[PDB]
């Protein structure tokens, strides 16, 4: 079977081809001791006090290749417990990724792991595979970066791709700031993980921000309580949708940018007029930062307001969209037609790391 | 129907995609042993010296480790069109012409060396503002005359240039181009009428 | 019905084994190591490597 490894800025998803869900999901972080030699994943987060935590993937782009190599090694040996030299490896790359980064990924896979076969697919096309649609626009929002990639007949349009730096990490920091404004204590680096949990459990997207604000100010029925790990209980209200609202109103974070709906509309407008109907009819939401409840309805109403009334808007948000990229990668790697696309070791030996551009698209 | 097809980039928008070669096409499992028996050679991002460049700047390549330090193969393409070089004395002795300034001739030769004797490009790039206006035939005449004179002075033989024939050829071409649609239609009508007259004559001769 | 019409998955194409000693198309496999080989010298080399391995391991 093939190995599908989806490297995300926050979390890495890895598993075998054909499986319904990734076999192993762990944070993408490398820990080095201040004065085994390097701990990756949840083992590093448990030893914050003695390890230097560094993220090698920033906004979907690899920065330190040694840390990325260690992450891949840990994945193959400890997470999946398989030999990279025996199984094909299907990696994912962020849209608009630099060419040299894809070349480095290819070199690392063939020369350090001796992988028999390799492929690099753009995460948006994998999310579209999981959606099962021929033409559409994918709005993938992860931990560190948000992309809007319109796809026509399965070919991503690189010119129309738009990148938004707002993502789950900034929403976590905004929820932390808001909770501090309410008077709770979470500024410590460890408490950041608790804010992440309360964001994942209680936050939701308001259908109408001003009406929800007025209702939550007039009545406390929209408030909910959360139990801290130490036994303390806090009650949060109005904040539950103020945090997700930053996705649609990035000025809340102080970033002067368009919202996710406006970014999607702008990316659609960058495409040809004829294909815009198919893009509007198929708007696919993927990534963890889209699992907030009601986000589909809010995106639908916003796009309907922006798009012409004669255009049919249909937002596709499957309940399993947090792993849509990995589900699509597994479907692709399980296909018989894809078997001819594998970059073989001989192709790398005869052509070098630039073979990835000749075969992968 | 067509026997064979010719095209540069591709023949038509309906063209089938090119077939790329690849292993594992029949499945990975069948080629598992072949791929597993070997290991890839190491590739490096390495600087390379290009001996065609006169400065010595070092660019970077994706190349195998064993290829490090080897001479750049594309430097073999580096060869300019042979153009003679003359001193002030040689020009004063042989190449002097009342119709051509020395600085003008040096400019013409500099353009010739820059554009590999592409005299149309030389004419386009010719500094008509500083020096006198020159036609492409004047540039060709001057260049070939100087080359012949320098060869005869130093050392074989080269064909002489005929500026008048080229001028007449271009004049005739321009006259043929500027003619109105009616004049060209009249020419084709005369061609077809002459062909039908000759056809009738040939038929009468064949009957006889 | 399922006895008369078994839905048999198509047979997988076999692994085209190669001799690790000479990298020739494999014609044989040694019963004791289950490693394929293509010539007698390959067999001798494989058995010497196997006795080396088994001495090193225990």
């Amino acid at each position: 079977a093939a190995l599908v490894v989806d490297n995300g800025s926050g979390m890495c998803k890895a598993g075998f081809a054909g499986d319904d869900a990734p076999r192993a999901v762990f944070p993408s972080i490398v820990g080095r001791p201040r004065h085994k030699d390097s701990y990756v994943g949840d083992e590093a987060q448990s030893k914050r006090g003695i390890l230097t935590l560094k993220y090698p993937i920033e906004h979907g782009i690899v920065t330190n290749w040694d840390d990325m190599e260690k992450i891949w090694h840990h994945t193959f040996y400890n997470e999946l417990r398989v030999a990279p030299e025996e199984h094909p490896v299907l990696l994912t790359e962020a849209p608009l990724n630099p060419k040299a980064n894809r070349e480095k990924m290819t070199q690392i896979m063939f020369e350090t792991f001796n992988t028999p076969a390799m492929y690099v697919a753009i995460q948006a096309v994998l999310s579209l595979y999981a959606s099962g649609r021929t033409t559409g626009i994918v709005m993938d929002s992860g931990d560190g970066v948000t992309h809007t990639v319109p796809i026509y007949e399965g070919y991503a349009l690189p010119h129309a791709i738009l990148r938004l730096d707002l993502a789950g990490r900034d929403l976590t920091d905004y929820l932390m700031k808001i909770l501090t404004e309410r008077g709770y204590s979470f500024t410590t680096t460890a408490e950041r993980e608790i804010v992440r949990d309360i964001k994942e459990k209680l936050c939701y997207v308001a259908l109408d921000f001003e009406q929800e604000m007025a209702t939550a100010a007039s009545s406390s029925s929209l408030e909910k309580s959360y139990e801290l790990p130490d036994g303390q209980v806090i009650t949060i209200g109005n904040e539950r949708f103020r945090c997700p609202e930053a996705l649609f109103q990035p000025s809340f974070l102080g970033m002067e940018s368009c919202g996710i709906h406006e970014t999607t509309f702008n990316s659609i407008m960058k495409c040809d007029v004829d294909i815009r109907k198919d893009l509007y009819a198929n708007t696919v939401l993927s990534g963890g930062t889209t699992m907030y409840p009601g986000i589909a309805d809010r995106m639908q109403k916003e796009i309907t307001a922006l798009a012409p009334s004669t255009m049919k808007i249909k937002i596709i948000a499957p309940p399993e969209r947090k792993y849509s990229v990995w589900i699509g990668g597994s479907i692709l790697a399980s296909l018989s037609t894809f078997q001819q696309m594998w970059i073989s070791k001989q192709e790398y030996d005869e052509s070098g790391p630039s073979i990835v551009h000749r075969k992968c698209f | 129907m067509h026997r064979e097809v010719y095209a540069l980039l591709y023949s038509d928008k309906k063209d089938a995609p090119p077939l790329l070669p690849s292993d594992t096409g029949q499945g990975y499992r069948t080629v598992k042993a072949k791929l597993g028996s070997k290991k890839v050679r190491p590739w490096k991002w390495m600087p390379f010296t290009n001996p065609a460049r006169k400065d010595g700047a070092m660019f970077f390549h994706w190349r195998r480790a064993a290829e490090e330090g080897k001479d750049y193969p594309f430097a073999r393409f580096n060869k300019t069109v042979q153009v003679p070089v003359y001193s002030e004395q040689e020009y004063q002795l042989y190449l002097h012409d009342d119709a051509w300034t020395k600085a003008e001739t040096d400019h013409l030769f500099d353009l010739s060396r820059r554009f590999d004797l592409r005299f149309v490009v030389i004419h386009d790039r010719y500094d008509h503002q500083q020096f006198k206006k020159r036609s492409v035939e004047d540039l060709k005449e001057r260049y070939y005359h100087i080359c012949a004179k320098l060869a005869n002075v130093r050392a074989l033989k080269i064909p002489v240039f005929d500026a008048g024939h080229e001028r007449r050829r271009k004049e005739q071409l321009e006259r043929l181009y500027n003619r109105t649609p009616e004049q060209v239609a009249e020419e084709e009508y005369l061609l077809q009428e002459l062909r039908k007259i000759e056809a009738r004559k040939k038929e009468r001769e064949k009957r006889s | 019905f399922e006895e008369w019409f078994p839905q048999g998955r198509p047979p997988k194409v076999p692994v085209r084994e190669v001799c690790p000693v000479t990298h020739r198309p494999a014609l044989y496999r040694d019963p004791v190591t289950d490693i394929p080989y293509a010539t007698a010298r390959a067999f001798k080399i494989i058995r010497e490597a196997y006795k080396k391995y088994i001495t090193a391991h225990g």
Partner: peptide, 20 residues
């Protein structure tokens, strides 16, 4: 398995039979 007893050989090199 063959990989457990033998080194794989680099492309363009003649196999010789080096062990682990």
């Amino acid at each position: 398995k063959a990989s457990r007893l033998f080194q794989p050989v680099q492309y363009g090199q003649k196999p010789e039979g080096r062990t682990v």
